Amino acid sequence: SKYGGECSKEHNTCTYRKDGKDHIVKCPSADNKKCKTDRHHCEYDDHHKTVDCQTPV
Ligand SMILES: [Cl-]
Ligand SMILES: [Cl-]
Ligand SMILES: [Cl-]
Ligand code: NA
């Protein structure tokens, strides 16, 4: 399952909604997954056990 939120460019974190609560996780440091655009959509995928702060559109 995918849980969405928004990323912080300054802190390279993703704040996502799951189980009624907001959770802050670091984004990856990888070039094409880190938070490059402030408040970009991000998601935690609990199937793949991944975070991506450059989700596609
Ligand atoms: Cl690194
Ligand atoms: Cl990457
Ligand atoms: Cl990850
Ligand atoms: Na980084």
Amino acid type, 57: V
Given resolution (angstroms): 1.1
Distance 45 CA to ligand 4 centre (A): 19
Distance 20 CA to ligand 3 centre (A): 22
Distance 20 CA to ligand 2 centre (A): 29
Q: Which position has the token pair 């959770």?
A: 23
Experimental method: X-ray
- CA separation, residue 47 to residues 2, 6, 13, 36 (Å): 8, 19, 20, 24
**Phi, psi (deg, nearest 5) at residue 22:** -95, 140
| 50-52: strand order across its sheet | 21-26, 13-18, 2-8, 41-45, 50-52
Distance 49 CA to ligand 2 centre (A): 15
- Which ligand does the CA of 12 lie closest to? 4
